[PDB]
Amino acid sequence: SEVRSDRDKFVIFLDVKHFSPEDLTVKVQEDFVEIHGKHNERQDDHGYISREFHRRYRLPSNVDQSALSCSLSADGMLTFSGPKIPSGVERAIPVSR
Amino acid sequence: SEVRSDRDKFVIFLDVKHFSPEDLTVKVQEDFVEIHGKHNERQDDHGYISREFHRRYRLPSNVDQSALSCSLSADGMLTFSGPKIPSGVERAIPVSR
Structure with a gap:
């Protein structure tokens, strides 16, 4: 988990x-x-x-429950995910290497 | 197990x-x-x-079901055991060290 x-x-x-x-x-x-x-x-x-x-x-209140996905990998890992909906109100910037 | x-x-x-x-x-x-x-x-x-x-x-047919015991060790091992009843019909000899 x-x-x-x-x-x-x-x-x-x-x-x-x-x-x-x-x-x-x-x-x-x-x-x-x-x-x-x-x-x-x-x-x-x-x-x-x-x-x-x-x-x-617990599912956060801002997760879009209309866009949930779930999959199981060959090695036995379950992934459940959903995007968050923007509410209109620091921000990490990815560093590519 | x-x-x-x-x-x-x-x-x-x-x-x-x-x-x-x-x-x-x-x-x-x-x-x-x-x-x-x-x-x-x-x-x-x-x-x-x-x-x-x-x-x-599966429990072997010669286990005495009137003398069964079961215990759980502090480290989380369950042991279930029963003696076998002699039926009247090579034999390992313990080597003490």
């Missing part, structure tokens, strides 16, 4: 390496991002393992 | 370091050991995290 928020955007990075994309759900409700995962795996000798989590995050 | 089984006993070791003793349940049913854990934690900014698992293990 890393949650980053700047003037331009809000981003959640969440390591979910033990989960398949179909195991995950992401919902936004009442100004919270709600992320759930559940993965079940058969073991040797008729055992099984279930891994499960929930993560609730 | 490590599951060990010798002529004397059956032992499950399971790392549950993110769980409190009150978060865990252990049940034996239909020749399976069923271990569950769920731990919820409040975060900063009104977030929360839930961690949850299930682990089902």
Whole structure:
């Protein structure tokens, strides 16, 4: 987990390496991002393992909830992001190298 | 997880370091050991995290189900064990050093 928020955007990075994309759900409700995962795996000798989590995050009030995106990388990182809407009211300048 | 089984006993070791003793349940049913854990934690900014698992293990038919024990170590290791009942039918000899 890393949650980053700047003037331009809000981003959640969440390591979910033990989960398949179909195991995950992401919902936004009442100004919270709600992320759930559940993965079940058969073991040797008729055992099984279930891994499960929930993560609730507060969503800043200026994130555009009509422009949210979420993706899962091949290496198991979930990225959830949204741009911030300008309200009309120091500014970092990128240094290229 | 490590599951060990010798002529004397059956032992499950399971790392549950993110769980409190009150978060865990252990049940034996239909020749399976069923271990569950769920731990919820409040975060900063009104977030929360839930961690949850299930682990089902087959219990050997010769384990004495009247003499099962389970404990959680300070460092978060769960040990579940039972002795085997002698049936009446090579044998390792310990080497002390």
